[PDB]
């Protein structure tokens, strides 16, 4: 019941092993490898989006 | 593996395209890249927005309160100590949590217990290892009123025992809210006629901890001081808000004195002078 | 001016000759007192290294019948501060015309020796000077107010980063919050 | 051009000619509560024409020395028709909103408003260990007013513009869904606001969902012959309003 | 058997055990107004749970010498929740009804009620060239009472049971949708009543749509040890209620 | 009346006019003193959160020749207590006729802000009021007793839940059981 | 993964179906769903009857008895202590077990041992770590009558040794009944002529524990107090019964004083008044 | 000799590993994942069952 995933290494130059030992999901370690984002709801939060080259309020 | 965006090369331009002219009056943040104004080269950028995520920012253990209790006294209320559970008595963990309005996280609790022999006439003793008991009471349970009270039996309540000299005790705690997120701020009242208390003090309701020495009356007083460390893990966070400028005053309200917005310069234009 | 809302207003008006300096600060998002308490300054004050570009947006809050021009210059360090408009136009700059589109963007390019600066102040990683100058004056018609207000904005670009956690230098408590 | 905008919600229509755009929340448009996120078990009430329509609040006058205004918004519509009645007869309410703010001038006036829509704006008090009365956090459709200096009234909010009554920097207050009313380009500011709360439905008297704030950064200024009285008029329309738990009228 | 009947309209349920049947109008079950018979042009309001539910009126006591009672019915539900509020805020109303009347006894009591539902029961006056006040035709949920003889009060309806206040023979009053409450077989009387008017929608204050009448033909009678207090309880539920023309609250 | 078997009997009889209140309690299975010691109150008193619907069954223990009607109303909070039969018939109610089928069921619907209430008392999760009113009186023939007895029942529906363990507030010992 | 039942939608009804009319005189609980009386919507309900099962309800460690014994005395009976094994001397674990009449479970036993130096003139000693011995005697075995008795050898009897400062000792115990379930209540006598003792005291017969200090006579008295924690696991339970209203009196019978059925109201109808 | 089974997680958004180490079945952990029930012997304990819509004692 083991899982292999890559480590945090640098660029231009791994595979640790994790096994969960407790019956609850609240005992698991922190999920410190989710690097995704979406700033489309804080920047650009408008209706009728703008095209960055047009005067846009033309 | 998600990189940041590369810088694309550009050349000279002369046209009716205007990326620099915009209007911030629509509440819109301009998406201007440096390759839209000046001539830039091609840069393969390998930076990772890794240690800025909401998981990596909050998942650090933080002292939330100091709990002090003794092992022999004249008055029985100083032989045990209790704490109504909140994260709002130390300003660092509070100000880190108040970036967001609603949060959802599992908690990891670690206790650090240290013992100091108090000053007395008979300090030359041979004391065996102290054992401490940390009992958590869910909201509504019976309250112990002495160190020898029969509510310390922990038939249903969670508890932990630590013998002196070991590693600190650690347990995990799931998401315990009756709603869908821990409300960091609650703009509202407690009663339906809009009276009572105003603020987040209605939605706290998390229970309270209890601390005592399992050993009986010793022949010398020893002051125990246990520190509670919270670690928020498995974090989700919603609807951000600006950080606090002013210094806090209390735990139950949000009230303050007005503070200046920033530090003064005493001039408005820089120069090559004493600046 | 910090104990009011006047700290946000940049005073600007019609000049006598030309070519005077409007305002100025140093590019330190997290150590400079101007952009210390800004949101970029707060989030960068929970970090110790930073990298990437910075947008500066300027909104002109004057009247619909007034015109004017400005020079928004960036100067990388090594020399001192540019002392006139002639020394300021030798760096990364932009001429902004005030018209229908009411706001301009000065996108400060990432120009550095290393990959990361420091958020706190040191001599080794110094970043430069943001300065603003009168290209042409503010010409206004009759029965219209002369003195107007520029507002300023800051944010990060899409290539921006932070690396090292630390505690904020702003949190100062002495006792508990009973 | 895209500066002309028209909005029809029910039997009320707003036509503007110098609009800018429309900010829609955090990208989410107001919709009804699904059966997966639902908690209560009984049938809700969806009026949808007698409720979802524009209600016009009081106009406030903007002098050169005005500092700001705020309205609490599940509570400023207490006495506005069948929205207020359906608030008084039900226990659980859930709605989105559309906030349109009118302010007009000429091409000779200058100034700049900031229209912010702040969720969970839990405000401070004037005296630190003191209780705030409900007549000062909210007053219905009559606006409360910020002050320029440190106010120290009895049972009142700390009214200082450089802290917005909440203890933050007022320049950093643009993280919320906002627009500007710039008097050289704008005439109005439309903000579509979905339902943001920690629970799927909530009572509409005991809770304050959000707080509209209008704060002038660039002060109003004009010459010696221009018009002095410049009003500011706020109009609000609930969206996707539904109601649960019918019982007798009251709030106690 | 078919004597047990159960009715659920909204969050209210009536279970009876000695019912008889259900009279449904003139064969027509209450339904909404179609687009072919519609006259107004704007969207109606259909609450359908907060409105269509059973409202319980006042209980009236039936002595041996009681003569009768009547209630006007778009008007007796003036102060009954969101039906009454939606009546007060709209101009045009349209609904059907379901009238359930409870009266219980034992197997030692005798008597017989007649529950009639009379459309357009334009009543006479006590004095012939005199005007009737509105407090005597209707009083809300409080019942008016017939009299056994020729009543000659001021500004009052002619209250005589053998003319039903309308000038006809009371034995011929069974042409309307009716049931009997016979105390040896019945316990209750359910009458489903659709919308009957000359126009598709009408105002619910200026008009009285119909009139419930409960008249005891066989007088109540019992022995020297049986229970004396026998109440009569009326419960009504609007059906297919919709509303048109929203404006401010009032009636003038 | 708790030191007898009379605590279970709901007194009911023939009335003078109509429309009086029979009994009443608050919907708190585990904090209200009426349904505290019931089996639902015991099992809910070993828990701290609860959720789901509640059945209330009323058995009429009078004579075979007597008739009557009752109004069994549920009122969610926010207002106060309904003070007459007119304010009680604006909520979730049912008219119950006494006949051959001797018992009725008032099934209290789950109407709540949250997903779970609290078993102990707090202002935030309040649940409402169970009340009972005379629709029509009790009509009885001659030589039959007038005053009769209603019995009441409670149970949980098929969508009911409990979440948090705790110790019961009822167990109180001082010494051991030698 | 077993969910609770969903709520199905319903509409208006007028027919001879009567779900609300029933008869509880047949001992039958009505299966009335809220979609049978009022108009309900469709609710996808995700609640799980998880922490209400008989396994999750009883499997909690509970203190059953406190055992006290010393390390040097004048009288030899106060240097060791014994306990006839029953679960009926603490009211919490007893009242949790008395929901059912017959039970079948494995037991998990944990001992918590704490030592307190008694008050004397020569408290300034240097005592090495105490070692305790907990010997279980199955029913019928030989009984030790001193701390130096030769029955403490544990040639066949189970035993456990604990040195001071470690984790608490823990062992598991299988199902030990001679019948098919632990009879929580026994309505009957001991003798066939219906005399003797009345109650569950005939079917207890579980053995008894013994506690002593492995060390010899020390030069200072130390009072040891060991607490026994039972944890019922692998649980099966049969034929439920109502919980106890009255306070207990003894361990061997079920006897009581009459208590009122519930707490009084002093009125019978609610109002909007001082209620 | 390992066994993989799911953890207790919430709705709308696992796989721990267990190995038994002792020779007896009385040493195993508690069986805290049996969520089944049958209230047909406490509710509805009768002969000639009732159909919930009929008068049932008709
Ligand atoms: C003895 C074993 C159990 C230990 C119990 C100690 C802590 C119990 C509560 C768990 C942590 C909850 C702390 C509060 C969480 C949120 O941050 C606050 N509601 C405010 O956001
Ligand atoms: C020293 C190692 C062995 C430890 C022996 C200690 C306990 C021995 C007995 C095991 C537990 C039985 C306790 C009684 C079980 C039932 O609850 C009772 N018969 C009443 O229900």
PDB file of C-alpha atoms in Angstrom, chain E residues 30-226:
ATOM      1  CA  UNK E  30     -58.247  24.810  -9.139  1.00  0.00           C
ATOM      2  CA  UNK E  31     -55.538  25.532 -11.708  1.00  0.00           C
ATOM      3  CA  UNK E  32     -53.418  28.504 -12.756  1.00  0.00           C
ATOM      4  CA  UNK E  33     -54.463  31.140 -15.278  1.00  0.00           C
ATOM      5  CA  UNK E  34     -53.500  30.307 -18.846  1.00  0.00           C
ATOM      6  CA  UNK E  35     -52.056  32.686 -21.418  1.00  0.00           C
ATOM      7  CA  UNK E  36     -55.266  32.623 -23.473  1.00  0.00           C
ATOM      8  CA  UNK E  37     -57.457  33.913 -20.634  1.00  0.00           C
ATOM      9  CA  UNK E  38     -54.829  36.329 -19.297  1.00  0.00           C
ATOM     10  CA  UNK E  39     -55.383  40.090 -19.409  1.00  0.00           C
ATOM     11  CA  UNK E  40     -52.462  41.788 -17.646  1.00  0.00           C
ATOM     12  CA  UNK E  41     -49.033  41.766 -19.255  1.00  0.00           C
ATOM     13  CA  UNK E  42     -46.502  41.371 -16.431  1.00  0.00           C
ATOM     14  CA  UNK E  43     -45.109  38.358 -14.608  1.00  0.00           C
ATOM     15  CA  UNK E  44     -47.226  37.021 -11.726  1.00  0.00           C
ATOM     16  CA  UNK E  45     -46.001  35.829  -8.323  1.00  0.00           C
ATOM     17  CA  UNK E  46     -46.451  32.151  -7.419  1.00  0.00           C
ATOM     18  CA  UNK E  47     -45.208  31.381  -3.878  1.00  0.00           C
ATOM     19  CA  UNK E  48     -46.910  27.952  -3.675  1.00  0.00           C
ATOM     20  CA  UNK E  49     -45.597  26.843  -0.259  1.00  0.00           C
ATOM     21  CA  UNK E  50     -45.615  30.018   1.827  1.00  0.00           C
ATOM     22  CA  UNK E  51     -49.169  30.696   0.606  1.00  0.00           C
ATOM     23  CA  UNK E  52     -50.944  27.442  -0.267  1.00  0.00           C
ATOM     24  CA  UNK E  53     -51.449  25.976   3.214  1.00  0.00           C
ATOM     25  CA  UNK E  54     -54.173  25.548   5.818  1.00  0.00           C
ATOM     26  CA  UNK E  55     -55.155  28.515   7.992  1.00  0.00           C
ATOM     27  CA  UNK E  56     -57.306  27.869  11.059  1.00  0.00           C
ATOM     28  CA  UNK E  57     -60.047  30.375  11.860  1.00  0.00           C
ATOM     29  CA  UNK E  58     -61.818  30.957  15.170  1.00  0.00           C
ATOM     30  CA  UNK E  59     -63.820  28.207  16.823  1.00  0.00           C
ATOM     31  CA  UNK E  60     -67.473  29.027  17.472  1.00  0.00           C
ATOM     32  CA  UNK E  61     -69.660  27.446  20.141  1.00  0.00           C
ATOM     33  CA  UNK E  62     -72.913  25.740  19.154  1.00  0.00           C
ATOM     34  CA  UNK E  63     -75.649  25.909  21.789  1.00  0.00           C
ATOM     35  CA  UNK E  64     -79.135  24.482  21.404  1.00  0.00           C
ATOM     36  CA  UNK E  65     -80.411  27.913  20.315  1.00  0.00           C
ATOM     37  CA  UNK E  66     -77.706  28.878  17.813  1.00  0.00           C
ATOM     38  CA  UNK E  67     -78.938  29.958  14.405  1.00  0.00           C
ATOM     39  CA  UNK E  68     -75.984  30.234  12.028  1.00  0.00           C
ATOM     40  CA  UNK E  69     -72.701  31.844  11.071  1.00  0.00           C
ATOM     41  CA  UNK E  70     -71.018  33.318   8.019  1.00  0.00           C
ATOM     42  CA  UNK E  71     -67.517  34.290   6.846  1.00  0.00           C
ATOM     43  CA  UNK E  72     -66.571  36.305   3.762  1.00  0.00           C
ATOM     44  CA  UNK E  73     -63.629  34.728   1.998  1.00  0.00           C
ATOM     45  CA  UNK E  74     -61.174  36.762   0.387  1.00  0.00           C
ATOM     46  CA  UNK E  75     -61.413  38.888   3.497  1.00  0.00           C
ATOM     47  CA  UNK E  76     -61.336  36.520   6.485  1.00  0.00           C
ATOM     48  CA  UNK E  77     -57.699  35.720   5.604  1.00  0.00           C
ATOM     49  CA  UNK E  78     -56.587  39.346   5.827  1.00  0.00           C
ATOM     50  CA  UNK E  79     -54.182  38.800   8.734  1.00  0.00           C
ATOM     51  CA  UNK E  80     -53.093  35.205   8.074  1.00  0.00           C
ATOM     52  CA  UNK E  81     -49.385  35.289   7.237  1.00  0.00           C
ATOM     53  CA  UNK E  82     -47.911  35.640   3.774  1.00  0.00           C
ATOM     54  CA  UNK E  83     -51.294  35.161   2.098  1.00  0.00           C
ATOM     55  CA  UNK E  84     -52.460  38.331   3.817  1.00  0.00           C
ATOM     56  CA  UNK E  85     -49.192  40.153   3.151  1.00  0.00           C
ATOM     57  CA  UNK E  86     -49.211  39.181  -0.528  1.00  0.00           C
ATOM     58  CA  UNK E  87     -52.812  40.407  -0.555  1.00  0.00           C
ATOM     59  CA  UNK E  88     -51.702  43.743   0.869  1.00  0.00           C
ATOM     60  CA  UNK E  89     -48.804  44.367  -1.519  1.00  0.00           C
ATOM     61  CA  UNK E  90     -50.421  43.328  -4.813  1.00  0.00           C
ATOM     62  CA  UNK E  91     -53.317  44.716  -6.815  1.00  0.00           C
ATOM     63  CA  UNK E  92     -54.717  41.626  -8.573  1.00  0.00           C
ATOM     64  CA  UNK E  93     -55.311  38.321  -6.843  1.00  0.00           C
ATOM     65  CA  UNK E  94     -56.571  34.952  -8.054  1.00  0.00           C
ATOM     66  CA  UNK E  95     -56.937  31.769  -6.033  1.00  0.00           C
ATOM     67  CA  UNK E  96     -59.016  28.710  -5.367  1.00  0.00           C
ATOM     68  CA  UNK E  97     -59.680  27.337  -1.909  1.00  0.00           C
ATOM     69  CA  UNK E  98     -60.234  24.227   0.188  1.00  0.00           C
ATOM     70  CA  UNK E  99     -62.672  24.631   3.080  1.00  0.00           C
ATOM     71  CA  UNK E 100     -62.517  22.002   5.816  1.00  0.00           C
ATOM     72  CA  UNK E 101     -64.878  22.356   8.787  1.00  0.00           C
ATOM     73  CA  UNK E 102     -64.400  20.330  11.975  1.00  0.00           C
ATOM     74  CA  UNK E 103     -67.159  19.514  14.446  1.00  0.00           C
ATOM     75  CA  UNK E 104     -67.146  16.443  16.667  1.00  0.00           C
ATOM     76  CA  UNK E 105     -69.587  14.801  19.040  1.00  0.00           C
ATOM     77  CA  UNK E 106     -70.292  11.357  20.477  1.00  0.00           C
ATOM     78  CA  UNK E 107     -72.823   8.675  19.577  1.00  0.00           C
ATOM     79  CA  UNK E 108     -75.235  10.187  22.120  1.00  0.00           C
ATOM     80  CA  UNK E 109     -75.448  13.666  20.561  1.00  0.00           C
ATOM     81  CA  UNK E 110     -77.719  14.557  17.661  1.00  0.00           C
ATOM     82  CA  UNK E 111     -77.819  17.452  15.238  1.00  0.00           C
ATOM     83  CA  UNK E 112     -77.127  18.377  11.643  1.00  0.00           C
ATOM     84  CA  UNK E 113     -75.155  21.237  10.064  1.00  0.00           C
ATOM     85  CA  UNK E 114     -75.340  22.529   6.493  1.00  0.00           C
ATOM     86  CA  UNK E 115     -72.036  23.821   5.111  1.00  0.00           C
ATOM     87  CA  UNK E 116     -72.745  25.916   2.011  1.00  0.00           C
ATOM     88  CA  UNK E 117     -70.219  27.810  -0.118  1.00  0.00           C
ATOM     89  CA  UNK E 118     -72.182  30.600  -1.799  1.00  0.00           C
ATOM     90  CA  UNK E 119     -70.638  32.679  -4.617  1.00  0.00           C
ATOM     91  CA  UNK E 120     -71.624  36.370  -4.739  1.00  0.00           C
ATOM     92  CA  UNK E 121     -73.738  36.357  -1.593  1.00  0.00           C
ATOM     93  CA  UNK E 122     -74.808  39.988  -1.813  1.00  0.00           C
ATOM     94  CA  UNK E 123     -76.682  40.424   1.452  1.00  0.00           C
ATOM     95  CA  UNK E 124     -79.567  42.671   2.407  1.00  0.00           C
ATOM     96  CA  UNK E 125     -79.816  45.346   5.069  1.00  0.00           C
ATOM     97  CA  UNK E 126     -81.824  45.540   8.279  1.00  0.00           C
ATOM     98  CA  UNK E 127     -83.329  48.899   7.289  1.00  0.00           C
ATOM     99  CA  UNK E 128     -84.303  49.036   3.647  1.00  0.00           C
ATOM    100  CA  UNK E 129     -82.916  52.413   2.508  1.00  0.00           C
ATOM    101  CA  UNK E 130     -79.882  52.259   4.823  1.00  0.00           C
ATOM    102  CA  UNK E 131     -76.157  51.666   4.263  1.00  0.00           C
ATOM    103  CA  UNK E 132     -74.389  48.665   5.792  1.00  0.00           C
ATOM    104  CA  UNK E 133     -71.091  49.204   7.561  1.00  0.00           C
ATOM    105  CA  UNK E 134     -68.198  46.947   6.624  1.00  0.00           C
ATOM    106  CA  UNK E 135     -67.797  45.653  10.188  1.00  0.00           C
ATOM    107  CA  UNK E 136     -71.083  43.713   9.900  1.00  0.00           C
ATOM    108  CA  UNK E 137     -70.747  42.056   6.495  1.00  0.00           C
ATOM    109  CA  UNK E 138     -67.279  40.853   7.488  1.00  0.00           C
ATOM    110  CA  UNK E 139     -65.160  40.941  10.616  1.00  0.00           C
ATOM    111  CA  UNK E 140     -62.104  38.925   9.609  1.00  0.00           C
ATOM    112  CA  UNK E 141     -61.785  35.578  11.341  1.00  0.00           C
ATOM    113  CA  UNK E 142     -64.512  36.440  13.875  1.00  0.00           C
ATOM    114  CA  UNK E 143     -67.874  35.121  12.731  1.00  0.00           C
ATOM    115  CA  UNK E 144     -71.094  37.054  12.330  1.00  0.00           C
ATOM    116  CA  UNK E 145     -74.287  35.406  13.557  1.00  0.00           C
ATOM    117  CA  UNK E 146     -77.750  34.956  12.086  1.00  0.00           C
ATOM    118  CA  UNK E 147     -80.806  35.549  14.242  1.00  0.00           C
ATOM    119  CA  UNK E 148     -84.011  33.567  14.529  1.00  0.00           C
ATOM    120  CA  UNK E 149     -86.345  36.535  14.075  1.00  0.00           C
ATOM    121  CA  UNK E 150     -86.509  39.789  12.113  1.00  0.00           C
ATOM    122  CA  UNK E 151     -83.480  41.785  13.242  1.00  0.00           C
ATOM    123  CA  UNK E 152     -83.730  45.568  12.931  1.00  0.00           C
ATOM    124  CA  UNK E 153     -80.343  46.836  14.107  1.00  0.00           C
ATOM    125  CA  UNK E 154     -78.634  49.963  12.805  1.00  0.00           C
ATOM    126  CA  UNK E 155     -76.334  49.553   9.767  1.00  0.00           C
ATOM    127  CA  UNK E 156     -76.586  45.769   9.954  1.00  0.00           C
ATOM    128  CA  UNK E 157     -77.497  42.833   7.726  1.00  0.00           C
ATOM    129  CA  UNK E 158     -81.042  41.489   7.929  1.00  0.00           C
ATOM    130  CA  UNK E 159     -80.293  38.439  10.084  1.00  0.00           C
ATOM    131  CA  UNK E 160     -83.040  35.864   9.608  1.00  0.00           C
ATOM    132  CA  UNK E 161     -82.246  32.201   9.046  1.00  0.00           C
ATOM    133  CA  UNK E 162     -85.262  31.511   6.823  1.00  0.00           C
ATOM    134  CA  UNK E 163     -83.925  34.028   4.285  1.00  0.00           C
ATOM    135  CA  UNK E 164     -80.141  33.512   4.832  1.00  0.00           C
ATOM    136  CA  UNK E 165     -79.587  37.278   4.704  1.00  0.00           C
ATOM    137  CA  UNK E 166     -80.122  37.178   0.926  1.00  0.00           C
ATOM    138  CA  UNK E 167     -83.907  37.030   0.454  1.00  0.00           C
ATOM    139  CA  UNK E 168     -84.354  33.446  -0.761  1.00  0.00           C
ATOM    140  CA  UNK E 169     -85.718  30.247   0.720  1.00  0.00           C
ATOM    141  CA  UNK E 170     -83.072  28.632   2.920  1.00  0.00           C
ATOM    142  CA  UNK E 171     -84.236  25.161   1.872  1.00  0.00           C
ATOM    143  CA  UNK E 172     -83.447  26.039  -1.755  1.00  0.00           C
ATOM    144  CA  UNK E 173     -79.904  27.007  -0.759  1.00  0.00           C
ATOM    145  CA  UNK E 174     -78.501  23.584  -1.728  1.00  0.00           C
ATOM    146  CA  UNK E 175     -77.836  24.524  -5.359  1.00  0.00           C
ATOM    147  CA  UNK E 176     -74.357  25.677  -4.260  1.00  0.00           C
ATOM    148  CA  UNK E 177     -71.433  23.304  -3.485  1.00  0.00           C
ATOM    149  CA  UNK E 178     -72.424  21.962  -0.090  1.00  0.00           C
ATOM    150  CA  UNK E 179     -72.097  19.172   2.429  1.00  0.00           C
ATOM    151  CA  UNK E 180     -73.830  18.227   5.666  1.00  0.00           C
ATOM    152  CA  UNK E 181     -72.303  17.579   9.059  1.00  0.00           C
ATOM    153  CA  UNK E 182     -74.630  14.914  10.427  1.00  0.00           C
ATOM    154  CA  UNK E 183     -73.567  13.967  13.926  1.00  0.00           C
ATOM    155  CA  UNK E 184     -74.405  10.264  13.574  1.00  0.00           C
ATOM    156  CA  UNK E 185     -72.209   9.650  10.506  1.00  0.00           C
ATOM    157  CA  UNK E 186     -70.013  12.682   9.812  1.00  0.00           C
ATOM    158  CA  UNK E 187     -67.186  14.431  11.551  1.00  0.00           C
ATOM    159  CA  UNK E 188     -66.047  16.945   8.922  1.00  0.00           C
ATOM    160  CA  UNK E 189     -66.890  18.474   5.553  1.00  0.00           C
ATOM    161  CA  UNK E 190     -64.326  19.184   2.819  1.00  0.00           C
ATOM    162  CA  UNK E 191     -65.238  21.572  -0.018  1.00  0.00           C
ATOM    163  CA  UNK E 192     -62.802  22.278  -2.853  1.00  0.00           C
ATOM    164  CA  UNK E 193     -63.787  25.589  -4.446  1.00  0.00           C
ATOM    165  CA  UNK E 194     -62.319  26.936  -7.721  1.00  0.00           C
ATOM    166  CA  UNK E 195     -62.178  30.570  -8.815  1.00  0.00           C
ATOM    167  CA  UNK E 196     -65.577  31.863  -9.950  1.00  0.00           C
ATOM    168  CA  UNK E 197     -65.779  35.481 -11.115  1.00  0.00           C
ATOM    169  CA  UNK E 198     -66.700  37.455 -14.222  1.00  0.00           C
ATOM    170  CA  UNK E 199     -63.103  38.675 -14.765  1.00  0.00           C
ATOM    171  CA  UNK E 200     -59.845  36.639 -14.796  1.00  0.00           C
ATOM    172  CA  UNK E 201     -58.267  38.449 -11.835  1.00  0.00           C
ATOM    173  CA  UNK E 202     -59.748  40.815  -9.284  1.00  0.00           C
ATOM    174  CA  UNK E 203     -58.687  42.861  -6.279  1.00  0.00           C
ATOM    175  CA  UNK E 204     -58.958  40.969  -3.022  1.00  0.00           C
ATOM    176  CA  UNK E 205     -60.186  43.819  -0.795  1.00  0.00           C
ATOM    177  CA  UNK E 206     -62.804  45.634  -2.862  1.00  0.00           C
ATOM    178  CA  UNK E 207     -64.497  42.353  -3.874  1.00  0.00           C
ATOM    179  CA  UNK E 208     -65.980  39.500  -1.833  1.00  0.00           C
ATOM    180  CA  UNK E 209     -65.674  36.326  -3.916  1.00  0.00           C
ATOM    181  CA  UNK E 210     -67.919  34.000  -1.896  1.00  0.00           C
ATOM    182  CA  UNK E 211     -69.424  33.374   1.544  1.00  0.00           C
ATOM    183  CA  UNK E 212     -69.261  30.266   3.701  1.00  0.00           C
ATOM    184  CA  UNK E 213     -72.488  29.553   5.594  1.00  0.00           C
ATOM    185  CA  UNK E 214     -73.045  27.001   8.369  1.00  0.00           C
ATOM    186  CA  UNK E 215     -76.742  26.679   9.267  1.00  0.00           C
ATOM    187  CA  UNK E 216     -78.095  23.981  11.656  1.00  0.00           C
ATOM    188  CA  UNK E 217     -81.360  22.530  10.374  1.00  0.00           C
ATOM    189  CA  UNK E 218     -81.692  19.840  13.039  1.00  0.00           C
ATOM    190  CA  UNK E 219     -81.004  21.588  16.329  1.00  0.00           C
ATOM    191  CA  UNK E 220     -78.324  20.383  18.707  1.00  0.00           C
ATOM    192  CA  UNK E 221     -79.756  18.279  21.500  1.00  0.00           C
ATOM    193  CA  UNK E 222     -78.390  16.039  24.233  1.00  0.00           C
ATOM    194  CA  UNK E 223     -79.267  14.492  27.571  1.00  0.00           C
ATOM    195  CA  UNK E 224     -78.763  15.721  31.120  1.00  0.00           C
ATOM    196  CA  UNK E 225     -75.209  14.396  31.503  1.00  0.00           C
ATOM    197  CA  UNK E 226     -73.524  14.776  28.131  1.00  0.00           C
TER     198      UNK E 226
END
